[model samples]
Target: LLFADEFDGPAGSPPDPAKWFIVPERETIRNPVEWDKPYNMGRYVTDQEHVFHDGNGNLVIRATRGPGANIREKYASAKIVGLWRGGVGTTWEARVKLNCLTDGAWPAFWLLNDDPVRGAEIDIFEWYGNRDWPSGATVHAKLDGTMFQTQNYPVDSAWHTWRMTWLPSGMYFWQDYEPGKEPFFTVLANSLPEWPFNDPGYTMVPVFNIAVGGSGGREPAGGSYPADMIIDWIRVF
Candidate 1:
C-alpha cells in the first residue's frame, strides 16, 4: 500500500494533523480568495466537535443544526482533506458510513486534483437523503458541458468499500469495491476533448466530508442533529 489510515484512536481525539487538514470555520467566508464553497446553509469548522475518532478504528465527521439565527448560521459541519497528491497509476480505496438519511444531509468521498491546468474532479461517490440522487459517480471536465456519470444504480446506506482507479488514459469507480474485479462505473478519457487525468502536474487528493444544505437543499426543520459520516479506513495504493 502506498498509504493507509486505519483510524484507530481514543474516542473524541482530534484527526491527526500529519494525515489531514480540516477546513477552517468561516464567516461570510474568509475571503473571495478562499474556496468559498457554499453547501447551502452551513459553515465548515476546524473544531474537534465536528470531527473526531470513535476509538474503534473510525473517523467521525458530523453535522449539527440549530446554532445561530438564520438557517445558514444554524447549520454546522466539517470536512478534511488528505495530505497526499495522487494520480495516474494511483488507486484509492475507502470504507465509510453515513448517518444522515433525511433530505439536507449530503456526504461524500471524492477527489480534486486542484491543479489549475485542466482541473478535473472525480466523485467516487456522493450520497443524498432524497431520491433526487440515489447513487452515482460523476467525472467532470474542465470545459463546460463535458462530463461522465452513472446515476441511481441501487446503493444502500451503509459502510461499503468505494474505489477509484486513476489511469493515464481514464478512470474507474467501484462500489462494494473489490480488487481484481470489474469496476461498477467507468469514465474514459477517449470521450473527452482533453484528458486531465493524464496531466503530468495533475495529482488528486481525497476529501471526506458532509454538507448540511446549500446545493443539497435542507432536511425539514428540526430533523436530526449531530448526524455523522463515519470513515472506517482509507488506503491508497
Candidate 2:
C-alpha cells in the first residue's frame, strides 16, 4: 500500500493531523440571493463530536440537526481531507458505509489538486441524497467546462468498496474493484482541454465529506434528524 489509514484510534479521538485536515463550514458569507441565509444551512464542524474514531475500527463523519428558529443553528456535519498527495498512476479506495443518504445529506469522496482551475477536480462519487439514480463521477476542468458523467446507481446504505484509478492519460472508476475487472466509468485525458493529471506540482489529495442543505437542498423535514457517513479504511497504491 502506498498509503493507508485504518483509523484505529481510541474512541472519540480526532482524525490524525498528519494525515487529515478539517475544513469547517463558512458562515460569514451570507447568500446574496437569500440575504438572511448563510451560503449553506449545514454547519460543517471539526469537533470530536462530529468527526472521530469509534475505536471499534471506523471513522465516523456524523451529521445532526436540531430544532431551531435560525436555519444556521439547525444543521451540522463534518468533512475530512486526506493529505495523501500524489501525481498520476494513483489508485485510491475506501471501504465505506453511507448511513444517511436520504433527505438533504450530501456525501462525497473526491480528489482535488492544489488548483482545480489549473489542474482537475476529480469526483469519484457524490450522492446528493435526493434520488437513487444518476450518481456522479465527474471531472471539472474549469476552462474545459464540466465533463459530467452521471451513473445509474444507488446507495443501499451498505459498506462497499469504492475505488478510483487515475492513470497518466485517463480515469477509471470502480465499485467493488477486482483483478482484471473492467471499470464502471471512465474519462479519457483527451476529453479535457489540458492533461494536468500528471503534473506533480499540482499534487492531488483525497477528501471525504458530508454536506447538507443549500447546494444539497435543505435537510428532510421531520425525517432523519441525524445522518452519517462512516469509513472503515482508506487505501492508496
**TM-score against native, each model:** 0.87, 0.88
lDDT score, candidate 2, position 41 = 61
Per-residue alpha-carbon lDDT of candidate 2 for residues 1-237, written as tens digits (9 for 90 to 100): 888999888899999989999887744543344522573367789999889999999999988887666546777888888877866787889999988777777788888764636856777878875443356677665524454444545556888899988887788889888999888888887876666775655568889988766554454454485787889899999
Superposing every Cα of model 1 onto the true structure, what RMSD results? 3.6
Whole-structure CA lDDT of model 2: 0.76
Clash tally, candidates in order: 4, 0
Candidate 1 at residue 153, lDDT? Answer: 49
Lowest summed lDDT window (length 10), candidate 2? 27-36
Report the lDDT of model 1 for residue 140.
75
Model 1, 110: alpha-carbon shift in Å?
0.3
> Pairing residues by index, what is the TM-score of model 2?
0.88
